[PDB]
Structure prediction request, 438 residues.
Amino acid sequence: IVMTQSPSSLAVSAGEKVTMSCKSSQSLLNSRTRKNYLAWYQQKPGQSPKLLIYWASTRESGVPDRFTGSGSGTDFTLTISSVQAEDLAVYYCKQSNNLRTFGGGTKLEIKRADAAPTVSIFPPSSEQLTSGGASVVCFLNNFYPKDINVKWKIDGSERQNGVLNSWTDQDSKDSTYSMSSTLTLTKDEYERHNSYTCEATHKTSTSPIVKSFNRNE
Amino acid sequence: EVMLVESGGGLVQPGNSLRLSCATSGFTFTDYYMSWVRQPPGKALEWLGFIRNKAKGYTTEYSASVKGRFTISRDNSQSILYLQMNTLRAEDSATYYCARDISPSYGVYYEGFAYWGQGTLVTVSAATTTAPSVYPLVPGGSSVTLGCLVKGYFPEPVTVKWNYGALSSGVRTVSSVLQSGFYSLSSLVTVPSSTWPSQTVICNVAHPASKTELIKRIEPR
Ligand SMILES: C/C=C\O[C@]1(C(=O)O)C[C@@H](O)[C@@H](O)[C@@H]([C@@H](CO[C@]2(C(=O)O)C[C@@H](O)[C@@H](O)[C@@H]([C@H](O)CO)O2)OC)O1
Ligand SMILES: [Mg+2]
Prediction:
């Protein structure tokens, strides 16, 4: 049996309604038990999947009214009457009529008001320098939307090599993002310059947020 | 209290085999089918197979993809589930879950996985198990943001805690990044400036694959 979910991802604001599709290559209706063997699971980042709806429309102990499972045969739907901050997750459907098969998943994201990042910069640690490594870290915290840009400047010159970028998952409380940008040099490259600047560009402003320090401090 | 705990995960070399285990407690083990589910990083859940309860004779079924390659068995005296993995490839790199499946022969029966283990990450690579280095992140107002930069570890994952899990608020942990065969991530926590350095701030970086814990006390410059 082949399970197909839709959409792969969508974003709505808190309070809005959402519908997710799940389709199977064969009917999941069991003629003996007269029930549809389709389940919905919720998987939040870094967490195990948790059961929401089983038998297509029966809500599991603990799950709120807000979730409703409908459908019969080969066409099923998960509805969230009103989405909240907790709902950030991928939603998986699973047939169990013939063994078990998971769908591909729907990731639920939240649209929210634009917010500007709080930007911090961190000089290397002595223990890393001691080992002959120099990581400079620019931290952008609690912004939205996700797309954001950091330019690194060393002694006024833009540096592009040795830079790594990583985001968090959308936050479960305020629906924002944070990201770190790391410039990684050898202790020797680092001690060859003084000014370390990272500039953060976001839609929340034309002018970049600038954070700097001087190695000689 | 129903418990499902996975073990055996970690780094395994291409071509080799791996056995996973799933200790359980809090329910009548032999009353339940048990399933295994896997999940490649950033990918969908994939059912692998199950083993049936006593009443059905503990018979096994597996998904098309893993037939002739993965094997399931159960120690009913100890309530432990097993997953035998053979001839592993990179495509098998994933988090492996055990899940309690149906109990259609006794007690409450409904079609769903009521309980899952926390999962164990298996990564199939010819590379080297190397524990991470943990560097502090401290500034050069009313709040201060600190963190630990975690670099050069393999394989995944690492988890970071603050004050042994007592400091949970304002924590941000960015996804890992892979570069030159090594992983790095950084984790930050924002606290009130009246809290640090007047009080203690420590992160605990755990790297399952090397059975390692590093504690890093965040000190002022
Ligand atoms: C008709 C097929 C099996 O019937 C029996 C059996 O012969 O063992 C007896 C029935 O009274 C009943 O207990 C069913 C089970 C079958 O459950 C499975 C299975 O074990 O293969 C798994 C279950 O999740 C579902 O996939 C069903 C399927 O819908 C029909 O076979 O099969 O009832 C749970 O076993
Ligand atoms: Mg059989």
The first strand of chain B starts at residue 3 and ends at 7.
